[PDB]
Amino acid sequence: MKAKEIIEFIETFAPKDLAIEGDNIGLQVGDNLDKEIKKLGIALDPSLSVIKKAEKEGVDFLFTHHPLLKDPIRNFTGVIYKKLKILMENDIILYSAHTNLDICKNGLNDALAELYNLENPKPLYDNGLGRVGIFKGSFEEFLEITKKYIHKNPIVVKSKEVDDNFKLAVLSGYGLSQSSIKYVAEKADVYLSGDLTHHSKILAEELGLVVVDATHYSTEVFGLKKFKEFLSSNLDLEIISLDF
Amino acid sequence: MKAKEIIEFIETFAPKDLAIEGDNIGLQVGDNLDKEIKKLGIALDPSLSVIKKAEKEGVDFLFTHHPLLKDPIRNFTGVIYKKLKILMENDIILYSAHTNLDICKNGLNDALAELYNLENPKPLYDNGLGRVGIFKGSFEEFLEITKKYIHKNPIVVKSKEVDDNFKLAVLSGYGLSQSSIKYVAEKADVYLSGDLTHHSKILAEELGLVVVDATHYSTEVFGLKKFKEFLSSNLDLEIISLDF
Amino acid sequence: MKAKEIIEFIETFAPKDLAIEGDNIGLQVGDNLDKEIKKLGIALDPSLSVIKKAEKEGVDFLFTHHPLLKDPIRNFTGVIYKKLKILMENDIILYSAHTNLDICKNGLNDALAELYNLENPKPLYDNGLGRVGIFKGSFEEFLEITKKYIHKNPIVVKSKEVDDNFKLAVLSGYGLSQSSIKYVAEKADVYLSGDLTHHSKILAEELGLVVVDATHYSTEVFGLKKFKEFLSSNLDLEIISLDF
């Protein structure tokens, strides 16, 4: 469809300047835009498996949530060498929307907000990430929606009894670090995100913040599935999932 | 009246230590604070026009909201040379109360909060700037007050619906940078401030924050007018505005 | 009971990672943690008086809220010499739980929250410190509770009329710096803490925050008494308070 034109469409949904400080968003690996494309792949992470499987299926435009490299390099060996080899031989464009996709209207965090039908939801953090608002319902109803739609067996740190109509906070991905938990404990009764260390569990219990670990995977793939749908039913392309 | 004493009065209303980190407040240019003062000028800005006009109208004490220099210098040429020449040649004192006037009780942000009759108003930012509270009324009633008392045709970024009794955030001056907007969006449904950039507009629509740009000038001058009157009523001394 | 066991108990109640960045918590002075402890002393502060008193009374394990040193040294003279000499000659162990005892469930801040029976209390600051919630009652009832259970004559900065069912912020210790006040003013109608500076007073008046200074001693010692009793109840040793 011309890569240039797909990218411009994605940057219309998720403007690049929504990305948090130092987020490596946009064109990752690629020369020759203007080239038309057939199979557009979509994955969470540009792991080698995902890059291999994209060549195997003749994907010529890989879209990932997570950037290829977080930190810059000037030597190319080991794993990064193979990933680039496959991508450069096969002329497969690799593009990324990371936090700009987590932050935009109807992005990964809005999707969680909508799922739980949060009342008057606002961004959680100063950088635009996450969403917080009232869950009009009970904690048990919150748990059912979560078990149904996000993750079947979520770790629940029930640090406090939860009244109906509590403030629910959600963060798609890794959101349960010690400092994240302290911050959100000021602003919410229940916090739904991924990756609960043992220390964070204890911290949550001490502060009285109820935490639900739905894993970083399930909370990201929920909104990513949605973005895939929005893509294929807006573009005449043919679009595959590579790690769902 | 005498210069020492006008300053003392101004600092009683707006104590210097209210000023945010790094703000150049207080005496800008002047050598003899015992100098009796016959005419006092007030301006938003110590512009060359304001300064020329001050000298031409025989102003011997010039008060400005904005300081002469944000960033220190060690060479004097061009515009700053011309400004200092006029102030020094005519022994016009130049004095500023900047953010301390924005932050103090009845100062520039209180003036806005009071206008909109905000319910249980509180400071917006960690540094004391801005006010946020509940506007007991409809979005419509709010716009009308804006158009009538602040600025006739404000650009409105109406990202989605605003219910009555919404959280209204106000900031006198330049309040619509990207980081400000991300921050206020956590705290308010509506944001009234000045100087909106195209990128900030997009950000507000993405985040769901309703923004009303009334210009930095209009939002500052409203409170400056109040500060002028308050000075008139308490001081026997001719007082003119040079800037508005 | 061995020293490492008492320490392990304390750290169960107040885990070390609860402490704010840079806080010097844990073993202050001591070498032999297998030491059988017969007499536990407890104090707000490892002052020279307290360390002398502890030796006079055969204390072999000294717990203090405040650390011995906040900033590191590499020279040993004056007061710090006299302190360490006593601790070392008598192999008295000195151990501290500082902000971790402030932040933990039923720690110093929670004790305040519980006393005023705050409605849905939450941590006040990003780092876990302080509690804030609704005081179900009048400003007057709130003062009677203060006067009776914390400090007899608290200084009150009545910056504003306070309605019933106000948002009350509590911070055990020194919470009344200018930056703390600007911040709490965003979040509360009334701030109960200790050690009010003159500039902080004016600042609170300007912003409309009602401040009650019950001193840093009285707000800390209240929770410390609870933790003493708790240490008595659980551990079997005799426990004397050297500071209160």
Residue numbers in the entry:
A (entry chain C), B (entry chain B), C (entry chain A): 6 to 249
Give excerpts from the publication.
MJ0927 is a member of the Nif3 family and is highly conserved among bacteria and humans. The crystal structure of MJ0927 determined at 2.47 Å revealed that MJ0927 folds into two interlinked α/β domains. Six protomers of MJ0927 are found to form a novel hollow cage-like hexamer, in contrast to the toroid-shaped hexamers formed by other members of the Nif3 family. Additionally, we found that MJ0927 is a DNA-binding protein exhibiting the ability to bind to both single-stranded DNA (ssDNA) and double-stranded DNA (dsDNA).
Two crystal forms of MJ0927 were obtained, one in the P21 and the other in the C2221 space groups. The refined structure was subsequently used as the template to solve the native C2221 structure by a molecular replacement approach. The C2221 crystal form contains a single copy of a trimer in each asymmetric unit. No significant structural differences of the individual molecules were observed between the P21 and C2221 crystal forms. Since MJ0927 is a thermophilic archaeal Nif3 protein, it is not surprising that the quaternary structure of MJ0927 differs from other bacterial Nif3 proteins with regard to the stabilizing structural elements, particularly the structural arrangement at the intratrimer interfaces. As seen in Figure 2(b), the intratrimer interfaces are tightly packed between the second domains of MJ0927 and the three subunits are arranged in a tail-to-tail manner. The surface area of each subunit buried in the intratrimer interface is 1110 Å2, representing ~9.1% of the surface area of each subunit. There are five direct hydrogen bonds and six salt bridges and extensive hydrophobic interactions between the monomers across the intratrimer interface. Therefore, the trimer organization of MJ0927 is a unique structural feature that likely contributes to its increased structural stability and which has never been observed in other Nif3 proteins. However, no metal ion was observed in the metal-binding site of MJ0927 even though MJ0927 contains these conserved residues.
